[PDB]
Every structure is written in C-alpha cells, then in structure tokens.
Paper text:
The best characterized [name] is that from the [name] (formerly Pseudomonas syringae) pv phaseolicola strain PK2, for which several crystal structures have been reported. Here, we extend our understanding of [name] catalysis by carrying out biochemical, structural, and computational studies of the enzyme in complex with a substrate analogue and using two enzyme variants.
Second, we examined the [name] variant of the [name],9 a substitution of a second-sphere residue (i.e., just beyond the immediate metal ligands) that eliminates ethylene-forming activity likely by destabilizing 2OG binding. We carried out MLCT analysis and elucidated the [name] [name] crystal structure to provide evidence for significant changes in the 2OG binding pocket that explain the abolishment of activity, and we used electrospray ionization–mass spectrometry (ESI-MS) to identify an unanticipated ligand at the 2OG binding site. These changes cause reduced stability of binding 2OG, leading to the adventitious binding of benzoate at the 2OG binding site. The [name] [name] had electron density at the 2OG binding site that was identified by mass spectrometry as benzoic acid.
Residue numbers in the entry: 3 to 84, 89 to 345
The structure:
Amino acid sequence: NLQTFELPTEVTGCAADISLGRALIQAWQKDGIFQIKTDSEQDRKTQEAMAASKQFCKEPLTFKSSCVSDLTYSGYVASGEEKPDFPEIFTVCKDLSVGDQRVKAGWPCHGPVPWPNNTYQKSMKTFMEELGLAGERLLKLTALGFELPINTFTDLTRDGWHHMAVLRFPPQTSTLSRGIGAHTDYGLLVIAAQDDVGGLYIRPPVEGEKRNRNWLPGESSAGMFEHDEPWTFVTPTPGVWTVFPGDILQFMTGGQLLSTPHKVKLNTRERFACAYFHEPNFEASAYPLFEPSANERIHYGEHFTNMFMRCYPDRITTQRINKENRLAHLEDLKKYSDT
Ligand SMILES: [Ca+2]
Ligand code: NI
C-alpha cells in the first residue's frame, strides 16, 4: 500500500511544511512513489479529462490522425508511434497562439495545440492547471525537505514547459502484454492519474542495485530490470494522484532521489490514464545542487526537443524543425547569458 499525503494549498516554509517535505523525500527513497489526496474539484476535473479522452478515442482514426501540428509536438500519436509501445496518446504541450512571440520567432516545439474540440480543450486545460498547482506545492516541499531555499526548484519552473500524455491502452489481444516497457522519465516531476482498470507498475529504490544516469548519452535506463522484482503495482485508488521523480530530479539531487522506473501492463480491457510532466522553463537549465564546481547542466528546452525529435523522426513537427533549421534558435537563446 502506497503512502498517501495531503498537500497544503500554500507552502510557506513553516515546520509542518519542512516535516512534510522530509516525509515526501523519505517516501520516494523507500517506495519510489507516493499518493497525494485530491479534493472534490481536483477529482472532478480528473474524471472529466478521462471522459473527454474516452470520447475522443472513439472518433474515427482519420479524424484522430488530423489532430497534429508541424509547430508543436502536441496532438495525436497512434499506437506504435512511441520495442514499440501500445497506447494511443494525445500530447498536450503549452498552448501558444501564432501571435505569441516565441511562435512568431519559430522556436522549436512552440505552437498551438491541435485540439479535437473545445470541450476537450477546456477539460484538459483546467485539469492541467490543477496539476500545475500541485506540482508547485511538491517542488517547494521537496526543496524544504532538502534544507534548500524554498524556491530552488520553482525558480526553474516559472512558465515551465509542463505537458501531459493523455493515454489509452488497448486491451490485451495476444500473449503480448507490454503496454509500455520499463523506462525512466526524462524530466523533472511526474504526476499521474488513472481510471479503475489497473496497469501501472513502478520500481522502488533497491539497496545495492546500480542505476544508470539516463540523461547521459552513454547510459540508458530503458529496459533495465524489466523482468526482475521488485515491481510495485500502482493499485487504482479513488481520490488520489501518484507522484514520482524523473531524470532531472535525480540529476539535480546527485542521486539522492532516483528517477523511478515505470512500465505499463495491458489489461484485459482498455485503460485510460493521464501522465502529467511538470518541467523547467524551456530556457532554464538544471544543475547539480549538492556538487558545486560541477559544470554539467541540462538545458531543458534542448533536452525536450532532442527527445521528441528522436522519438518521432518522421512527424511533420520534426521535418519542419529540420527544414527551417529551428534548432539554431536554441543556440541563439543562450548567447549573451551567464553560463
Ligand atoms: Ca541516455
Ligand atoms: Ni513516462
């Protein structure tokens, strides 16, 4: 049974906050994950998002495939597009109009979400606003728990590049049941919601077990431990989201937090879930907190752009980045800055 915490609406740095932050860190260090309670509005917005997802996935494939953009990676991903994995996905990135200064300047990955309809748009936006409020609480508590200035992480996540995978896993249709293989998240923080079907498994930290640093070119965590215990089944539970660290938190904490390996098993019926990714600003760089004079950085926008180009080399978004040399804007943004 996972540990469950109730986050305060505001985090100020009081004693209850520091104690809670330490408890969250301890729960990640023991279990790799914990649950946070949702109130009735957070829960309602979660359920309405799931419902919009189910309705959209019932639309014809020709329509679903049209919900794509050559400016942003937001939009529909057919099954097998992300060993290929089985879910269909609608990716929600920051929803920027063509009038936004970054979109006008052609920054890679910046553009308007190709929403299937307004009802879906409103459900996802209000859900992601609540998820973001929780992500900020969590990052202030984590900072306090490490005896860091309260805004250590949230200073990096102002206008952060938050995004969400709106997932539908098919039922099992053969002996194969690997929905998503074992891997770690490449970003900062993951907040996850699911329906009552069941399928998410996570790996807690294991004493004496070597973990790769998945942000490095020569170390990949993908596929590791897939067929070896321990894997904790994240039991569907009403009134909670789950929370686990990604690669960037492992990097910034020097391994005091480990990026939680996770995988999804196909069930005997379809399964809906939403994986929310709370991130630094596209222009922000993560850095090691506990190792001064370390020069390593993770420029988040470069990190995100490279990952999606590699995952989707043939998507129209990737093609336009190549045709228009949009990666050049990433280099230009760093010029004349202190790094
Ligand atoms: Ca790697
Ligand atoms: Ni993930």
